[PDB]
Design a protein around this ligand. Structure first.
Ligand SMILES: *C[C@@](C)(O)[C@](*)(O)[C@H](CC(C)C)NC(=O)[C@H](Cc1ccccc1)NC(=O)[C@H](CC(C)C)NC(=O)[C@H](CCc1ccccc1)NC(=O)CN1CCOCC1
Ligand SMILES: *C[C@@](C)(O)[C@](*)(O)[C@H](CC(C)C)NC(=O)[C@H](Cc1ccccc1)NC(=O)[C@H](CC(C)C)NC(=O)[C@H](CCc1ccccc1)NC(=O)CN1CCOCC1
Ligand SMILES: *C[C@@](C)(O)[C@](*)(O)[C@H](CC(C)C)NC(=O)[C@H](Cc1ccccc1)NC(=O)[C@H](CC(C)C)NC(=O)[C@H](CCc1ccccc1)NC(=O)CN1CCOCC1
Ligand SMILES: [Mg+2]
Ligand SMILES: [Mg+2]
Ligand SMILES: [Mg+2]
Lengths: 226, 250, 233, 204, 222, 196, 196, 233
């Protein structure tokens, strides 16, 4: 997986590739790794896929209840604190490595969190198997006072580096932009540089090609009247 | 430093009455009037913001509460009992439903869970029943719009329209005359404001009235864009200005 | 079978229109200890070849002596030793690749990763890799260790395929190499600031640059980073 | 020793034009010994179909578990569970055994009764969801099924064409796996009719 | 401890026609999750109208091909420039592989060419030298993905004549070179989608009575 | 990691490098290892990033609750709370922590807590992987009752050497000054400290 | 073991502690780790006592035979013979050797040979378990072209610190001075060097 | 189960005619690193008992707090806390011995060896050992770690059996202890020159001596030792 976060002038952008794997096999070519914790707090996930989903949903559920209880819009530091304490308690066994970003009344924020429960602060971050390829691009092109357009460009370029150079990553680039005083914009399949070419041949079979022993109707309906 | 009250504090009397439930219903009768009306394309719930002092900021006290994005609740009776029930109702919507099925519960089942919590306070050791009646309005895909009442016993009933608390007998008669099965949501809001004016003594405006609807999806209130299936909350609390606009055409 | 003791980190390289560039830092690490700060890991062979070596330094010094002895041996009874029968990059590589695979096959490897960079007689660019296992491969960009993970992505943005090689000048290619060395200094815990760089061009020959430093570093944003989440000061 | 390959078996699912297909082999073994040639791996709860590969005791246990849960769902909700909702229920149920998991590879298939939209999904043993447009594979010949599906499949196939494609994907994948085969079943699922077909295949 | 083996990934495919044979291989070379090269040739013209590939651990693969190429050279010297037949090449390769029975070459080898009757021939080897002639074979990382497809599309397995209930099999046919190359390209496009170690490029060597021809096709680079 | 805390005439100064490692990869090059547990009680962190963060978060909680009930805690008290957590959970923790603080009564104090969970009150302390390379240097160059400028130079020169020889240390040198005057943050970049 | 060799204006000086350990027991407290391989080529020994003695005995033999045939060997040549033995027998040896010598042509030279059998020519070198604690100190205090008295003090102060912090080092500080003037042996006792 | 981290070496002790002497150096080692040079390992309890502790220092500090808390607890509702109901050496020892054996029996020991030295109410000498296993024993001389191997032989030459105790004065006994500490400094690689010594006498009470140093050391013969056999210079 390749996931990144990049801060800019008036907010923060996160991005991710869309490949999930099972051994050396690609299980899903259009995986969604940008998870919504709350409307303006989103995070990118790497690691054990079930764990990242379960952990984002649990903390996202508890963040929603906390928001209703306090009559306040959720804060990124709260999502961070609740995620790290949960992951620390499980001593690394919950294999969730996350980049947590968002906007709240305090401002815009960008953090990373690792499976053992350590967190870090930064203006640019990368995680997953393609994090070295992505960090190379980030270390070469990042500057202070980036615009929205520049940060989206830099984030997607950093994912592309992971797509092309890391065998763990591939397919498409997903982006989510969180700007202060605006709705968060989730851009699913922001780039699509890996469409399969047309096949040489059609493999549609003639009807009757497969040998059958028995046919029967399956009753899916409930017990009937009369 | 022991909880020794492991026995029921609500029991059957010789006449077959459960005294504490009846007495809880009496507490609900003393409470401020609240109502609910169901339209074809929506549901409205409403109540009076009875301010305990003019120095108090009545905006901070929310009698009408969001439970899920498509479900809202109002009450009559004891306010603190209502507040803790709203906390528990919000939580049980997640724990016993959303964390299992990945979607919010339908209105009737969330009502069922709240009802269960209120029943248990009517039978468990060392507790009194909740001194509230709730009106829960909501929408879900397969059942459409709905409106439910929940009493201190745990019993619940679906309503086309109803009222609870202080002037409920008079308010229910008023609604019987005005309600029909072809009402639009705006017509139901208009009828809700007319019904509620009868039970209010003092000032009657957007600052002393609390009103919310279960209506169309509000994508502008969602807070994010990019997922076509997530179209926004159907619950919306009307503003002070929005209420006053409709009071001029009253 | 052994374990590496004193070690050298990444060697990085690429092809450009008229030749090849190769680079490596001047460090010999002793585990986490940054023990030796003046170690040259680019070793020229003649005026047309540079062998860049990472991994065990004792084994590097052995390989250095093999190459030095190879030049001596090639000169024997060879009137064209400085002309048509001079050592080629392809000859030097194949020799090393033979030795590497022979040593792994005796379960006593030379614990190194090697990149041979040069220009052939006909002006063709030569760039090929070999390691302790005898595994060999060629590509428009090549890098060992951390450089494979971090330098290659950056260098491949300049030369992504064979057809990009004629379009890439020596200035653009050197710039890319120098930037890649900075990125490795930010991110590799067993790297140093000081490095050597070698250009082998078909026209201008062998240019060997010593005592280079990583410069134009960005650390200023560090002042604004406080705590690990909730700390405000 | 590896629980996911003691008994053997496979499941594959595919989408078509206004239809879905789900198919499985019939083998149950104890490593090299073939025991049963009637061990079906596809079950249904109303109109939602579930295939399960892996350790056979857990296949049976999970069938009984999801029958239990979907029966209670229907009593309370007063409607049949849909594929999208059932998928989430499978995921929730698997993940609650995170550190002592069921050694299984489940596959959901069905048509949403309201929207009419074809739906398939797959899961790992701890409940991660793969919601594919095209196809889902599972079992000891999953590599083989991935190869067959990725080449044979095209979108928007009619029900009777989709039958041929999924059958040939299953049969040829099974014949390259020692622990799969011994018969096969194919379900063709449309909005209000479901046809079940037993395939003639080599019995070794 | 020192491990003398490694895995360079890659995937290869041999198909035999009536008067031709193809040997195809992807051009990607990898270790772990890194790409070493996007174009590193893996299928080689060995002379005498024989093409060879030894996929797996690339150092052992290169060593084996190098030794076989040399075996062809010395076969010419020792037997009066006689053409090494494909069957004879195969038996020679068995002895090269079995010579390292207790320290094997970690490769799957395929050779292709024409037999002594001019008919297309593909031979296939395990790491320690067991071999068999076949119409079809895929080897390497994505062999498990590709082989079942070839069983179905080259040898017509599990396919029957429509309307015969299921008692007349689809009759076996030789495929044209145009039809084989279509199956090769689709096999590798499919493998590239689902296997991380497969990609970058496809290089096909086609062997006829006229000689050895090459074709190259781009594959996805992710 | 290279960390140190040094008492001086006007108080105490904490210092650290900014490197976080996963194997030989530098996961964070601008890490802040100097963390606030109270207004004028800080700590230097070394060992597991997860463990030392978890501990420091718990200590910050304990001292916030101490302050609500009993007023400002002493540096000794803060060190005792760190110790209790490190000692009692010694089997499950990898944490090497230096606690430093300023009282008006006690002035500058430094307590070091190594792996076992023992406590040691000292005039100055050094810790982390890179500290091994500067025991000699620090012992020869430390004096008691130094000035602020002298103590900044002592830490800058010391951590410069620790960074130079330890591959696990690097980046910027962060410092935190604790006196009666308040809390001052200082940063020193590679171009400054490498040429020393 | 703490050992070092330092080039200076008039030549080179070798230094060592005198401790030999079996586990935590001190088997010899007055060990001589500075050993003659030729009149003006000496070495500092660290690692296995058996291995470094065996190697040094073989090198002394090789250089005696070199001298009989070809005259006085260079320091570089002596270092090469050490290297050959250490490199080729790397699997079976635990030897860390510093080679130091004086020519009239080349003046003072120092070569260090760590565990792998690599060679490194340096202005000065430090080695042994106790050297880790003085990398900082030695880097800050070494200058080229020092006087004899300055270089004796540099080694005395350096090994004093190495001894202070390393339990595996101790006893007396032995030194051997190599110049045109000849070969001088120096010894420094605990009461002298501890109070530095 | 754990491993000791910061450690203290030998504690040595003996009986003499009117009381007991105990001693231990002021070092806290961190493996081979001589990390902490000001660690007190003799801890007095009242005016009649000194507990000398070796092994893990974190566990030593825990034990120190237990003893401090034991004095506090003994004073509670006890008008004779500084007289007939004061803590005795025998009471302090049995408490520690109970704790040590309980902790080993839960597979979570206090990783220490302990010597309790003191004088009882009736003037009787008390000297007894306990360790991480709960093993206990008494003898006219006692020592932990290296002290068992090196100090005991020397101290047993002064008091070889019970009948030698009345014949041994405080001057002779202290001299023997001070010499033993020098021998340990020559020969124990995890020792220091600086140490503390405590005398508990039935007449003169508790005398606690801090900042003692090993003196009168012989190193002069070292100058005459050259090579390892054949070397003459
Ligand atoms: C791909 C990536 C570049 O690594 C990136 O990090 C993504 C990010 C996700 C999608 C948020 N990660 C994955 O795709 C993980 C990689 C991974 C695999 C294995 C362990 C840890 C990480 N992929 C998955 O988690 C994968 C998702 C499926 C394909 C939908 N699940 C598995 O591979 C599963 C993990 C099981 C497991 C159990 C306990 C601890 C950790 C992991 N393994 C299997 O399914 C293997 N096997 C099980 C028995 O049946 C046959 C298959
Ligand atoms: C740099 C320094 C000298 O070590 C200094 O002490 C810093 C101080 C921190 C910033 C407060 N320490 C680190 O950087 C630690 C060093 C360390 C590693 C492992 C155990 C203890 C200490 N680094 C981390 O804690 C690191 C932070 C992540 C990258 C955000 N975590 C790991 O490396 C993680 C720790 C697992 C662990 C935790 C506790 C005990 C034992 C192990 N380890 C991995 O992820 C292992 N890694 C190995 C290579 O393949 C990938 C997995
Ligand atoms: C002190 C120092 C810092 O280590 C310094 O390097 C000196 C330098 C010498 C004097 C030239 N080195 C020693 O003192 C070595 C340290 C060492 C120990 C073990 C392996 C390598 C180095 N000490 C010895 O060589 C020691 C000399 C004897 C006492 C005369 N020999 C041993 O300790 C012996 C070595 C066995 C061995 C040899 C080579 C590789 C691995 C192991 N070991 C034992 O006798 C082990 N001993 C353990 C405790 O129970 C008794 C047996
Ligand atoms: Mg089979
Ligand atoms: Mg990729
Ligand atoms: Mg010492």
């Amino acid at each position: 997986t390749t996931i990144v976060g990049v801060k800019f002038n008036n907010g923060v952008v996160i991005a991710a590739d869309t490949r999930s794997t099972q051994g050396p096999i690609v299980a899903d070519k259009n995986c969604a790794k940008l998870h919504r914790i709350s409307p303006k707090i989103w995070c990118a996930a790497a690691g054990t896929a079930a764990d990242t989903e379960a952990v984002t949903q649990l903390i996202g559920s508890n963040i929603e209840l906390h928001s209703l209880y306090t009559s306040r819009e959720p804060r990124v530091v709260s999502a961070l604190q609740m995620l790290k304490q949960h992951l620390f308690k499980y001593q690394g066994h919950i294999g969730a490595y996350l980049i947590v970003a968002g906007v709240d009344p305090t401002g815009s924020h960008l953090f990373s969190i690792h499976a053992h429960g350590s967190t870090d602060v930064g203006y640019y971050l990368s995680l997953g198997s393609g994090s070295l390829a992505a960090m190379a691009v980030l270390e070469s092109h990042w500057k202070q006072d980036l615009t929205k357009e520049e940060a989206i460009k830099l984030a997607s370029d950093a994912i592309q580096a992971g797509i092309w150079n890391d065998l763990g990553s591939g397919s498409n680039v997903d982006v989510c932009v969180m700007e202060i005083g605006k709705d968060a914009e989730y851009l699913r399949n922001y780039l699509t540089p890996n469409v399969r070419e047309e096949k040489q041949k059609s493999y549609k079979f003639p009807r009757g090609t497969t040998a059958v022993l028995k046919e029967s109707i399956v009753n899916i309906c409930d017990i009937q009247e009369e | 430093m022991t909880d020794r009250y492991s026995f029921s504090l609500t029991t059957f009397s010789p006449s077959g009455k459960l005294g504490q439930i009846d007495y809880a219903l009496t507490a609900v009768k003393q409470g401020v009037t609240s109502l609910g009306i169901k339209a074809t394309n929506g549901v409205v719930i409403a109540t009076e913001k009875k301010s305990s002092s003019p120095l108090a900021m009545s905006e901070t006290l929310s009698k009408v509460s969001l439970l899920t994005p498509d479900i809202g609740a109002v009450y009559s009776g004891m306010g603190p009992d209502y507040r803790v029930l709203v906390d528990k109702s919000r939580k049980v919507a997640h724990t016993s439903y959303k964390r299992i099925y990945g979607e919010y519960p339908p209105t009737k089942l969330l009502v069922s869970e709240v009802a269960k919590i209120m029943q248990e306070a009517t039978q468990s050791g060392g507790v009194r029943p909740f001194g509230v009646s709730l009106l829960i309005a909501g929408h879900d895909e397969f059942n459409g719009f709905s409106l439910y009442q929940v009493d201190p016993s745990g019993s619940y009933f679906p309503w086309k329209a109803t009222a609870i608390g202080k002037g409920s007998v008079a308010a229910k008669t008023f609604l019987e005359k005005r309600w029909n099965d072809e009402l639009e949501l705006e017509d139901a809001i208009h009828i809700a404001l007319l019904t509620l004016k009868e039970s209010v003594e003092g000032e009657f405006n957007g600052d002393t009235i609390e009103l919310a609807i279960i209506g169309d999806e509000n994508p502008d209130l969602l807070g994010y864009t990019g997922i076509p299936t997530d179209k926004g909350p159907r619950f919306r609390k009307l503003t002070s200005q929005e209420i006053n606009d409709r009071l001029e055409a009253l | 079978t052994q374990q590496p003791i004193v070690t050298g980190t990444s060697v990085i390289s690429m092809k450009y229109d008229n030749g090849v560039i190769i680079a490596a830092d001047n460090l010999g690490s002793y585990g986490s200890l940054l023990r030796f700060n003046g170690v040259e890991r680019l070793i020229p062979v003649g005026d047309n070849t540079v062998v860049g070596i990472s991994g065990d330094i004792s084994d590097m010094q052995h390989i250095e002596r093999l190459l030095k002895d190879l030049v001596t041996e090639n000169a024997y009874d060879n009137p064209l030793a400085d002309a048509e029968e001079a050592l080629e990059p392809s000859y030097i590589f194949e020799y090393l690749a033979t030795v590497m695979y022979q040593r792994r096959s005796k379960m006593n490897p030379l614990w190194n990763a090697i990149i041979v960079a040069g220009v052939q007689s006909n002006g063709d660019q030569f760039l090929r890799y070999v390691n302790l296992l005898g595994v060999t491969y060629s590509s428009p960009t090549l890098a060992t260790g951390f450089g494979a993970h971090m330098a290659n992505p950056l260098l491949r943005k300049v030369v992504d395929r064979e057809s990009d090689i004629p379009k890439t000048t020596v200035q653009v290619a050197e710039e890319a190499i120098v930037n890649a060395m900075r990125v490795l200094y930010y991110r590799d815990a067993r790297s140093s600031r000081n490095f050597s760089l070698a250009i082998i061009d078909k026209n201008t020959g062998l240019t060997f640059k010593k005592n280079l430093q990583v410069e134009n570093m960005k650390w200023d944003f560090a002042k604004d980073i406080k705590g690990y989440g909730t700390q405000k000061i | 020793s590896d629980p996911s390959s003691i008994n053997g078996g496979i499941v594959v699912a595919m989408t078509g034009k206004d239809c879905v297909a789900i198919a499985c082999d019939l083998r149950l073994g104890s490593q090299s010994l073939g025991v049963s040639n009637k061990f079906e791996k596809i079950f249904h709860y109303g109109h939602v179909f579930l295939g399960i590969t892996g350790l056979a005791t857990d296949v049976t246990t999970l069938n009984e578990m999801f029958r239990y849960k979907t029966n209670l769902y229907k009593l309370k909700e007063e409607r049949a569970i849909e594929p999208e909702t059932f998928t989430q229920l499978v995921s929730s149920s698997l993940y609650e055994r995170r550190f002592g998991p069921y050694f299984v590879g489940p596959v959901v298939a069905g048509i949403n009764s309201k929207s009419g939209k074809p739906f398939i999904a797959g899961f790992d043993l701890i409940g991660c969801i793969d919601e594919a447009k095209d196809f889902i594979v599972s079992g000891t010949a999953s590599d083989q099924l991935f190869g067959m599906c990725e080449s044979l499949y095209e979108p928007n196939l009619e029900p009777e064409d989709l039958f041929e494609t999924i059958s040939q994907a299953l049969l040829n994948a099974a014949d390259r796996d020692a622990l799969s085969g011994w018969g096969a079943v194919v379900y063709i699922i449309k909005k209000d009719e479901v046809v079940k077909r037993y395939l003639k295949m080599r019995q070794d | 401890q020192f491990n003398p083996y490694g895995d360079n990934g890659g995937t290869i495919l041999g198909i035999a026609g009536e008067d031709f044979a193809v040997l195809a291989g992807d051009t990607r070379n990898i270790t772990d999750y890194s790409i070493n090269s996007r174009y590193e040739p893996k299928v080689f013209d060995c002379g005498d109208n024989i093409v060879m590939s030894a996929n797996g651990f690339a150092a052992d693969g290169d060593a084996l091909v190098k030794r076989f190429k040399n075996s062809v050279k010395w076969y010419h010297f020792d037997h009066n420039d006689k053409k090494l037949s494909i069957n004879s090449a195969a038996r020679n390769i068995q002895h090269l592989l079995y010579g390292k029975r207790f320290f094997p070459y970690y490769v799957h080898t395929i050779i292709a060419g024409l037999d002594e009757d001019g008919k297309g021939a593909v031979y296939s080897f395990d790491p320690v030298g067991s071999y068999e002639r076949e119409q079809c074979r895929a080897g390497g990382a994505a062999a498990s993905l590709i082989m079942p497809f070839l069983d179905n599309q080259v040898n017509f397995k599990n396919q029957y004549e429509p309307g015969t209930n299921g008692k007349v099999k689809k009759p076996l046919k030789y495929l044209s070179v145009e039809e084989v190359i279509k199956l090769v390209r689709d096999s590798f496009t499919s493998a590239t989608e689902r296997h991380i170690q497969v990609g970058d490029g496809l290089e096909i060597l086609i062997v006829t009575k006229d000689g050895v021809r090459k074709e190259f096709y781009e594959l996805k680079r992710d | 990691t290279s960390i140190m805390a040094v008492t001086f005439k006007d108080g105490v100064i904490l210092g650290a490098d900014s490197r976080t490692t996963t194997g030989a990869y530098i996961a964070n090059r601008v890490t802040d290892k100097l963390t606030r547990v109270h207004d004028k009680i800080w700590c230097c962190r070394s060992g597991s990033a997860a463990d030392t963060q978890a501990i420091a978060d718990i200590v910050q909680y304990h001292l916030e609750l101490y302050t609500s009930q009993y007023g400002t805690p002493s540096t000794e008290t803060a060190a005792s709370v760190f110790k209790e957590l490190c000692y009692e959970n010694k089997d499950n923790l990898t944490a090497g922590i230096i606690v430093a603080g300023y009282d008006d009564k006690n002035k500058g104090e430094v307590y070091t807590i190594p792996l076992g969970g023992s406590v040691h009150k000292l005039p100055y302390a050094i810790a982390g992987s890179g500290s091994t390379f500067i025991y000699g240097y620090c012992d020869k160059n430390f004096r008691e009752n130094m000035s602020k400028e002298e103590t900044v130079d002592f830490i800058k020169h010391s951590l410069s050497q620790a960074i130079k020889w330890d591959g696990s240390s690097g980046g910027v040198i962060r410092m935190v000054v604790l006196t009666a005057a308040g809390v001052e943050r200082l940063i020193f970049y590679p171009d400054e400290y490498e040429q020393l």
